[PDB]
Design a protein around this ligand. Structure first.
Ligand SMILES: CN(C)C(=O)c1ccc2cncc(NC(=O)Cc3cccc(Cl)c3)c2c1
Ligand SMILES: [Cl-]
Lengths: 305, 296
């Protein structure tokens, strides 16, 4: 019993964290085999950030300008190249603690664990989701740039995020491990803002099925809804449109509890209309959207209470 | 910016998790040097233990089988002397925590870690964790510099879904026993010093709507706290909140006048740090550490 926001064990990622210094800037790098991956803005000054020309800044650098530190040992840089918004530093030593890994690009609504670092030293781990507006509601301070997001399934680490910057509203933006940003953001000090954020509907539904499994049904009603009428109402509360793909994904949770997806959609409609009336669902007074259908099946028991 | 329930990096603990089997029961063990620590219920415990021999206990570390060469009991924990010392043994201490203090939990099944999460020791000595069957032997810890301080070992789940366990010396937290009997958690209270610390974290993050010009005596606040099922706030708690009061410029008894107003009138449709409830699982030290950047 119990339902917590759970992160993956961080050990396989801790062994890849290094410190990168270029001039006066210091941030984090990911050391996998004989390559260190980090944000390309490590080559920029604060002034350069208004309109940086990365190709012109990189051409003026040599390998010995980049200092890479792994614990107490200094790694020697023997090459450098750029791939989108990531800098790849070829080093003379391969990482002996390199785990089995993949670089994957996630879609909005997908969750992941974040290992927050400062000076190539891990300080904490937490779970979060890629928001519909492509931002992350994380917890980051200055020096955290280059911290990474990941999922672990079996003995394989799937790297999905690298932290690049914080926006005026306190939210965070970054790239996949190939240097392509999530969202319409640039690694430039520009007047860019996060778009209006919406609630991840498929995730709220999954979390309602988790409440049923753990033994709670007070929020259920005797009504059903068409998929179209549900989206007409939910759009009015800033909820993401629910697609037929989302319905298909919720299939096993619907089968395990005996509650059809469009019947769970009717409880959500009523919950939005009435509020909680002093009650909680799984210890929360708000409707939770940072747990995917896959996370609910992974964490919750296979036997309903 | 941002405020999340953060756990310590679990790597140093992952390298100590092993699987223990005795008869039909299978649970988790902590391998430190040449000893494996696990709940004694894996087996009148003294009389049950005397019958057993070393070869009855099967210890598995990853793919390798460890051979048991001795066994002894300490309170509610079983200590299995193994023939191999753990090469990944970190620098460690066994510490007993007090109610209100927080810690990270590495949840395991079959000696294999599956997740990490942060939680607090409640005033009623239970933990609101997330555990399934096979999680027995999962451990709680904190990290200070490079030293792992083990504070909890999971033993059982209670009828209300909450969890109970011991320190690493086998002494339970709370009035619980390791056996199938009628045991219930006592009435729980809110950790007042922790709610106040979380309100200071909201002012550091630009949330100030709940602030006011009023102050209160510590005695007038404890009478309001007694009515709302909140733990009594002591002078020690006031002293502990000193650096957060100095950093924000808001005196502790001014922050108590804000908590008094939130306990009577509620939030009025508003949230604090993305929450509609008052949060009590962040200590004053956790607030200072998350709003500073201490690394390990
Ligand atoms: C907001 N202030 C003043 C902080 O000290 C702060 C606070 C928190 C921070 C969290 N993450 C990153 C940080 N910094 C940057 O975004 C660095 C940067 C600047 C401009 C463009 C790019 Cl692509 C990168 C953080 C910085
Ligand atoms: Cl995805």
């Amino acid at each position: 019993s119990g339902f917590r926001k759970m992160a993956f064990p961080s050990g396989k990622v801790e062994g890849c964290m290094v410190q990168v210094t270029c001039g006066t800037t210091t941030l984090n790098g990911l050391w996998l085999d004989d390559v260190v991956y980090c944000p390309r803005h490590v080559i920029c000054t604060s002034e350069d950030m208004l309109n940086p020309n990365y190709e012109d800044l990189l051409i003026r650098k040599s390998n010995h300008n980049f200092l890479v530190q792994a614990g107490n040992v200094q790694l020697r840089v023997i090459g450098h190249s750029m791939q989108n918004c990531v800098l790849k530093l070829k080093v003379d030593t391969a990482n002996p603690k390199t785990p089995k890994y993949k670089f994957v690009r996630i879609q909005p609504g997908q969750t992941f664990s974040v290992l927050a670092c400062y000076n190539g030293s891990p300080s904490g781990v937490y779970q979060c989701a890629m928001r519909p507006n492509f931002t992350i509601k994380g917890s980051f301070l200055n020096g955290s740039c280059g911290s990474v997001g990941f999922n672990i399934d079996y003995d394989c680490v799937s790297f999905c995020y690298m932290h690049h910057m914080e926006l005026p509203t306190g939210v965070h933006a970054g790239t996949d491990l190939e240097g392509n940003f999530y969202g319409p953001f640039v690694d430039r000090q520009t007047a860019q803002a996060a778009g209006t954020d919406t609630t991840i509907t498929v995730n709220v539904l999954a979390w309602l099925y988790a409440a049923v499994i753990n033994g709670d049904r007070w929020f259920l009603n005797r009504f059903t809804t068409t998929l179209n009428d549900f989206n007409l109402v939910a759009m009015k509360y800033n909820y993401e449109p629910l697609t037929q793909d989302h319905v298909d994904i919720l299939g096993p949770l619907s089968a395990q509890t005996g509650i059809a997806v469009l019947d769970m959609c009717a409880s959500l409609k009523e919950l939005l209309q009435n509020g909680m009336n002093g009650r909680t669902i799984l210890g929360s007074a708000l409707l939770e959207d940072e747990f995917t259908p896959f996370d609910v099946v992974r964490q919750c028991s296979g036997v309903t209470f």
